[PDB]
């Protein structure tokens, strides 16, 4: 019998969540979550969103999530290739620009924003809880 999640992670529902130790571009953030046998945050419901905002309520830092698109002609997709479900959140910020390395989304102050993927931000990683 093992714990649902490792020490320092937050156990919520079927998953475990962790804030990254550092601030890096999106690709490096993706790599760092993978190294923890995890992936960047994927929001499947408004319950997920509300839990995340509860958890980052005390931070003003922007946190990358696993949502990105190459440019505005591409829909937003999660790392696993699934789409952003409707009625979860409206992505604001830099949504009309095209960046050499794509556009990625981060959550900050309870909202989701588009930004150049080459910029640095902390991130939230998640993995399945051992239940």
């Amino acid at each position: 019998c093992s714990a649902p999640c490792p020490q320092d992670w937050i156990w919520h529902g079927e998953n475990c969540y962790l804030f990254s130790s550092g601030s890096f571009n999106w690709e490096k953030s993706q790599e760092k979550c993978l190294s923890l046998d995890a992936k960047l945050l994927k929001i499947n419901s408004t319950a997920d969103l509300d839990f995340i905002q509860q958890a980052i309520s005390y931070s003003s830092f922007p946190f990358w999530m696993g949502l990105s698109r190459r440019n505005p002609s591409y829909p937003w997709l999660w790392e696993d290739g699934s789409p952003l479900m409707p009625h979860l959140f409206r992505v604001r910020g830099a949504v009309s620009q095209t960046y050499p390395s794509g556009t990625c989304a981060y959550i900050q102050r309870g909202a989701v924003y588009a930004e150049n993927c080459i910029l640095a931000a902390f991130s939230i990683c998640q993995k399945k809880a051992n239940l």
Copy 2:
């Protein structure tokens, strides 16, 4: 019903070492913060070991907010005491700031950016609850 595999800590809490921690999601005065922890059969944060301090320092490094702990001083002529009635030891930190007789309900301690400060207990801050992990 005896559990088949009891988790060290409940959902939404963070497990570190011997304890479980619950970070608030809003700012409230000390009494309300204390009540919240008590309602969960827990208590406000008590930093009693270097492990506790290191964990809290890292967890709050993502924040500029103040977090109430379970340490208070009734007034200047009384000592700092944890909720469990034990005294504040001098090993981990000193409480910086003012302890005023003009405060209506005593002086309370919060941790912010790693340092611990005194403040009027009726002001609002985030807080951290703590209880023993089921190991």
